[PDB]
Design a protein around this nucleic acid. Structure first.
Lengths: 198, 125, 93, 114, 242
RNA sequence: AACUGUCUCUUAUCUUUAAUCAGUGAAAUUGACCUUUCAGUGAAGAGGCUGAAAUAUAAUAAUAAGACGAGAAGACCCUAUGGAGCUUA
RNA sequence: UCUCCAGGCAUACGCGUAUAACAACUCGGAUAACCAUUGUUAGUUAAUCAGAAUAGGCAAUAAUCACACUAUAAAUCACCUAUAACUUCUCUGUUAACCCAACACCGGAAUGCCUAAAGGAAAGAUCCAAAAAGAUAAAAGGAAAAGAA
RNA sequence: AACUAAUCCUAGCCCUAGCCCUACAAAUAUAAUUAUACUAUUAUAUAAAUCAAAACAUUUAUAAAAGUAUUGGAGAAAGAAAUUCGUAAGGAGCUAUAGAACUAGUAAAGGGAAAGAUGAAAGACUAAUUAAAAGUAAGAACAAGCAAAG
């Protein structure tokens, strides 16, 4: 299965990789989790490509193909809304960039500085530039659903914030089933006879 | 509760109590013509009609007068690209008649210029 | 038959790599080493044919002796049957 | 279409999270009082194929010795299974050999691609 | 591939690993040691030299043991090394005669023997050779104890040896009940075979029995983690008090 | 023996088939063939050789009497100081 | 609506969604139309239909409208005495033009009812060839009716 | 520039080296996969023959000494020793009729297949490439004849 820009399992992916397809597999150089340094929202400079030398923010990363996608960069032109009545409207369509085709940007100085992974006091891994050493903080990305947690307003069937955070568990030598009995006063005096497990 | 082990009963043994229920049921609009008080339900195949009667009476506080249940065979004719038969999951349809004179009705869910052709309109020339 | 419609990519091979460059080195170990180590001792490969050569039957028979106890039961039975055919061909024809 | 299908997934996640929390509390108390890591009695037993599999004990109204059917159930491996055991070991070795062959072919294309 | 160890070493590895290693050292030594049974039907070559064919010169010799079959009934009886010889015979003891399929049967019997140690008379399958050995052994009890397993050639006899050895080892009053004075004489008479109780238990035990016995010895009920934490908590608190 | 279209002795109608339109669509077969007649030659023997003769191209439609038709290890019978197998007292 | 045909309906067995509606008109039907094909969704409702305690004691006489009547071919747990238990309606099957015959096969396929009120269509069109096949008819004759040897 | 077709490179394999090894629920041996009693519960003989002896009968293998002596319907063949001696990932392999049967043990014992191909990107409308097999079309035939030769 060849990974493509289309999300795996999508209709385009199914056409891209039909069940009978046995194309010559494309080999992607394995990159370790520690080795990988590109994440969505990271400002990076394109080493080579259509928009080489233009710094952009990552929006999608297909780690399987070592592909980093920059919105509005490495862009070719395609037609949206092509129909019988109308020819269609040209729009910007991005193309994937391989990991070696981009480099991270030092915030203070905008350059494609090579980086080395190192931990911090908190222990969180942070990329450090090999030259002009500096901490590149993890970029902030909005939630996929578009919901800002604080701005969210409770809808029907949604517990209020305080209710979820309230702690009522009291450590005791009783299970949920036993505790439920005490609260609701379930009492059973009948007893199963001896059972030979085997 | 489904896909769980129930205690074996012996003479004088404790009454069987299910404190947490894994049975999940779906109310379905009648495919066939049924009395209005009658309500159809799609229920797990391991559930008994008594369990449904207890389930509705206790969890949902619904009075039940009569219950009729049928098992619909899932078609296995369908085959995949490999010619392997695909079996539709079998489901149990339960016809429940309400008591206390209650009646049920399924709610209505989901209520260039022609004179100058071949020259793009962009051209002013 | 039909032939490729595309040309293969060009390939370049280095003839002075260490393996090719140092091929044959120490082949005179015996004469230059006082014959303490025979060049046959420098052979690395299947155990039953290190420093030894023979016909197919001899090679198969020697292979059975060297690794017969460490061979699979199925392989040993197959080897026994194969040896029978080899023995008859060479020793009767 | 079902409106807001994510709602069902969220509930299932909430329901699933509840069960593990309840199970965790039950598991902790069970271990303390009895030391058993499994709610149901069980043991490792050998089937007729020579494999070792966890056998969950069943409660019966009668004991095993007076349960002829339970005695009829086979928990013993026949003598001929020794050949199968050797085949299983050989099969595992063959799998590793095939695995190396699989890696080798992948390595070829890495050189070709790069 | 090729196995690093030959198939015969697989048995050795199994004995050297697992519950087999945990088996008692005394029992392991008894299993590991092998003693040849006394020859009865074949004799080793009296002379150590003979004429080599190819060179026509005197050479060292080798011995070919005759095949003798000991049926399991011997393991349930007390045979004095006698056994069934299965093979071919030349009629009239001349090679020129016909070859006849022959099964050679030693004369087998069932007889009763009195055991002083067990204070009981046991009716068992026996051969005439065993009876002479019993007389030579100065008593039936002596023969069972004195004779080794291979020469004894009897699982029941070894089992009898196990019981006799344990009886001697423990000085159990079961010997000659109601006659303590007589009991001491038997123990004194067979004092030579007194051994540790642990060793006597494992004498003559089969491999399957030994493995199960060792498993039963080492099987222990699961520890309630409440108790384990109680012991751990007390130890830490006791250490803290120090 | 009679009886009747079995026949003397055949005829007519109906149905099936037949012929035309449209749709769908095999099998045995197949060295390549620009695939004639007469006499000769030959192994009983010639569309293809020798010598005569005939001959716009392409198509289309009909029949199985004879060559005591062509043929096979089909059919039938018998033989062996032939083999081999079998039974034994 | 007309012309014409005359084994129909249940259960058993088997099959297992081939059922029905909708949407398709490519493939499958031994060609189409039309679907039995393709896709989607639905379906078969059961206290009544169907499937899923013990120990002793003690039993002569067929049926045939069972009476007469005979016969040979020889054909009938119960109930008593004790012991034991002590208030129940769930589960499962239910569709179909269906199955076994490589097939939408021509035949194979248990039982009950009944014989049309049930169930059906021989005509892809045109022509009216010959020949061939089946059926009907024969002037006069009658092997060139059913009787004898 | 034509239809039918054709094109491709990896799916993987193969041999040695190295290495032994000691790693969901639910239902089930009852009738396996049937949620609880029935009914006690269970494998394995010389390995043979085929085959060789041109049939067939005893018989027929499966470090040096040495294929020697011995053994053998002395024939097909079989075959020691004494006594010396012995430290410790690769392929002048295959690349979809090849290489494992394999993309796969998938589609009564048991038997056992067929096939795939764009590009960096399809969130660039899915790629091209080929007077390239036979088969056909573009463009039927013209007295005379192993179809050709001069």
């Amino acid at each position: 299965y060849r990974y493509g820009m289309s999300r795996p399992g999508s209709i385009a992916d199914k056409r891209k990789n039909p069940p009978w397809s046995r194309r010559r597999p494309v080999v992607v150089e394995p990159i370790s989790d520690e080795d990988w340094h590109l994440f969505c929202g990271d400002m990076v400079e394109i080493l080579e490509g259509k928009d080489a030398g233009k710094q952009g923010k990552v929006v999608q990363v297909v780690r399987q193909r070592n592909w980093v996608v920059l919105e509005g960069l490495n862009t070719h032109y395609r037609y949206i809304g092509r129909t019988k009545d109308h020819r269609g409207t040209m729009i910007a369509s991005e193309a994937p960039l391989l990991h070696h085709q981009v480099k991270l940007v030092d915030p203070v100085d905008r350059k494609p500085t090579e980086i080395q992974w190192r931990f911090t006091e908190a222990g969180e891994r942070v990329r450090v530039s090999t030259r002009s050493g500096r901490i590149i903080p993890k970029p902030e990305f909005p939630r996929a659903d578009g919901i800002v947690p604080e701005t969210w307003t409770d809808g029907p069937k949604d517990t209020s914030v305080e209710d979820a955070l309230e702690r009522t568990y009291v450590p005791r030598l009783k299970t949920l089933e036993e505790d439920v009995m005490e609260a609701m006063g379930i009492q059973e005096t009948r007893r199963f006879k001896k059972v030979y497990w085997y | 509760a489904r896909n769980v082990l129930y205690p074996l009963y012996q003479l004088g043994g404790p009454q069987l109590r299910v404190f947490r229920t894994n049975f999940f049921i779906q109310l379905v609009r009648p495919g066939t013509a049924q009395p209005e008080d009658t309500v159809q339900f799609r229920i797990p195949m391991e559930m008994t009609r008594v369990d449904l009667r207890n389930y509705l009476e206790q969890i949902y506080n619904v009075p039940v007068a009569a219950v009729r249940t049928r098992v619909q065979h899932g078609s296995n004719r369908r085959r995949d690209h490999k010619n392997v038969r695909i079996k539709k999951p079998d489901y149990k349809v339960a016809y429940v008649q309400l008591a206390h004179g209650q009646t049920f009705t399924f709610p209505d869910l989901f209520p260039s210029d022609l004179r100058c052709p071949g020259i793009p309109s962009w051209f002013g020339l | 038959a039909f032939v490729r419609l595309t040309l293969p990519p060009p390939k370049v091979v280095d003839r002075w790599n260490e393996k090719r460059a140092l091929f044959g080195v120490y082949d005179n170990i015996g004469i230059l080493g006082n014959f303490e180590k025979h060049p046959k001792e420098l052979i690395k490969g299947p155990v039953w044919l290190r420093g030894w050569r023979g016909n197919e039957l001899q090679r198969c028979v020697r292979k059975k002796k060297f690794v017969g106890n460490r061979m699979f039961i199925e392989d040993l039975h197959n080897l026994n049957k194969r040896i029978s055919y080899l023995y008859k061909h060479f020793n009767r024809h | 279409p079902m409106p807001s299908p994510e709602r069902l997934e969220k509930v299932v996640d909430s329901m699933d999270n509840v069960d593990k929390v309840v199970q965790e509390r039950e598991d902790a108390l069970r271990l303390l009082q009895t030391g058993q890591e499994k709610p149901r009695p069980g043991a490792w037993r050998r089937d007729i194929f020579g494999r070792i599999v966890w056998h969950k004990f069943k409660q019966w109204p009668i004991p095993w010795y007076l349960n002829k059917r339970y005695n009829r159930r086979r928990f013993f491996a026949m003598p001929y299974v020794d050949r199968f055991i050797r085949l299983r070991i050989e099969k595992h070795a063959r799998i590793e050999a095939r695995k190396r062959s699989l890696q080798k072919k992948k390595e070829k294309i890495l050189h070709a691609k790069f | 591939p090729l196995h690093r160890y030959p198939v015969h070493l697989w048995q050795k590895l199994r004995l050297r690993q697992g519950i087999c290693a945990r088996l008692p050292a005394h029992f392991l030594r008894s299993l590991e040691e092998e003693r040849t049974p006394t020859p009865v039907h074949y004799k080793p070559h009296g002379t150590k030299f003979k004429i080599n064919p190819k060179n026509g010169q005197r050479e060292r010799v080798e011995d070919v043991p005759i095949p003798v079959h000991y049926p399991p009934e011997s393991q349930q009886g007390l045979w004095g090394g006698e056994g069934l010889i299965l093979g071919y015979r030349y009629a009239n003891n001349d090679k020129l005669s016909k070859r006849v399929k022959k099964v050679w049967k030693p004369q087998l019997f069932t007889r009763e023997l009195y055991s002083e140690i067990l204070d009981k008379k046991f009716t068992v399958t026996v051969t005439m050779r065993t009876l002479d050995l019993i007389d030579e052994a100065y008593g039936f009890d002596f023969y069972i104890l004195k004779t080794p397993k291979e020469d004894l050639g009897s699982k029941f006899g070894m089992d009898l040896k196990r019981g006799m050895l344990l009886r001697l080892a423990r000085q159990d009053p079961h010997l000659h009940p109601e006659n303590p004075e007589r009991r001491a004489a038997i123990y004194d008479k067979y004092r030579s075979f007194v051994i540790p109780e642990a060793e006597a238990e494992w004498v003559g035990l089969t491999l399957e029995e030994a493995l199960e016995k060792q498993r039963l010895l080492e099987e222990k009920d699961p520890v309630p983690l409440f108790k384990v934490y109680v012991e751990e908590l007390v130890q830490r608190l006791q250490e803290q008090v120090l």
